[model samples]
Target: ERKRVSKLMAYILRHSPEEFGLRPDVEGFVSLNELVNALKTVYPEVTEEFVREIVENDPKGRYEIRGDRIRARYGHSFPVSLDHEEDTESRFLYHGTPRRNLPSILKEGLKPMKRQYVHVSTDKIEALETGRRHGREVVLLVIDAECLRKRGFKIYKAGKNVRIVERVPPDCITLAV
Candidate 1:
């Protein structure tokens, strides 16, 4: 049930909270109470406390609960204007995807597709883990941060391991393994 709750929360919070009668703030935060009430529509036993627990316990560091509000850390289909500091210190970044898409990625570059931004990581292990979720066969892709910054793609530091960008240039992406 906890797993289902997380998936439902991801749907409500990141993709279509509006569909549940919850409107997020400019920074994509909604009242914690409001979120719980919305979740109750699907999971009748869900409560604010339980939602808080899920947010805190998420292994992927996917949620942020501050004061009385909560928002997904990243992976939003809705265009939430997150206020993250511009990062200038990253030397290299990493992305993970199934090998099936590698050719297209090599051709068209890394675009957000369904998500609002291309999610990359500073940690190699984290990148591999992310790709592992897509399928059995995964490829770790390396991003040359200096090349991207020079090309004027602003990289936002979303969290300790997470970085967000509009798109990654094809030339800047290379197969890690």
Candidate 2:
């Protein structure tokens, strides 16, 4: 039941809230009451208090409830702008993907296929977990952050462990363990 709510929330917060009549802002935040109304079918027991619990209890800290609104901290497919600070502190980053598309990804580089930006993790474990979700045979690709920035691809610190970049250059992409 909880997973169902989380996935539905992801669909509403990150991908397409508009499809549910939940209005998201330029930063992808929908009003508290608006979201409660949208979740009626799946979670008829939802309310302001439980919604706060749902957002807070999310293991990944995926969604945040602030004041009378909530927003997904990362993974946006819409045209919303990221308001996080620029981060170049991380020395390395990882991109999780299926090994099947590696040839094309290596050739063309990691582009946001359906997302607004290419999401990269700061560590291997997270990347590994991310890749496992998409395929049985997963590939973890590494990117040297300093070199990447030097090469001209700007990266941002979207959240505690998430980094966002418009795209990665072909030369900067490499395989990781």
Candidate 3:
């Protein structure tokens, strides 16, 4: 049963939400059509009835159907916690002119202010390309913004707009872990 669930999740993650006629920006859940289509693509022998049966039996299958849209409580599965190990690091290189150096600023100025990880957009390739000539090696630690928010970090959403949040440290830094 666990193997079957894992396979289903793997299939859903690979396919786009649009393929199942679900809106991409819909919050809280995913469309049933999307899940069904993904299952069909991976398991061609899977029928709508079988998919319904699985959902009916699974504990995580709580979803809401409204008009043409289906929303699942397990809309998106994410890591439960952030991995905060001091030695962890990631690098980014910046090119273009000094005026156009967002990557460098994010690496040097923005990240050092807080002892937390940062999330970059999938579209950040353009910024990376622009920074290649500037000897940029922007290292960052990836973290879950939602987790950080729950821990009382002040989060700001930048213009590019994703769940990625810049976290500021608490007022008091203590030695007591």
Which candidate wins on TM-score? 2
- Please give each candidate's TM-score: 0.92, 0.93, 0.32
Listed per candidate, the RMSD to the true structure in angstroms reads: 1.6, 1.5, 13.3
lDDT of 3 by residue, 1-177 (tens): 445744564335323455545444334345566666666676677765665565456532333344443433321333212222221122221112234434455445334222123323223443344334455553222333344445564333221222233432322111110
- Candidate 2 lDDT tens digits, 76-109: 8888866788886888898888888788887888
Minimum summed lDDT over a 10-residue window in model 3 is located at 168-177
Worst 10 residues of 1 by lDDT: 168-177
Write one digit per residue (lDDT tens) for candidate 1, span 1-177: 999999999888899998999999989999999988888898999988898889878877788988999999789998798988888999889998889988899889999999999999999989989899989788889999988999999898886788999999899985556
Model 2 TM-score, all chains together: 0.93
Instruction: Rank all candidate structures by their lDDT, best first, as comma-separated numbers.
Output: 1, 2, 3
Candidate number achieving the greatest lDDT relative to the actual structure: 1
Model 2: CA > 4 A from native: none
> Of the candidates numbered 2 and 3, which has the greater lDDT value?
2
User: Which portions of model 1 show Cα errors greater than 4 Å?
Assistant: none
- TM-score comparison, 1 vs 3, better candidate: 1
**Whole-model lDDT values for every prediction:** 0.89, 0.82, 0.38
| Better candidate by TM-score, 2 or 3 | 2
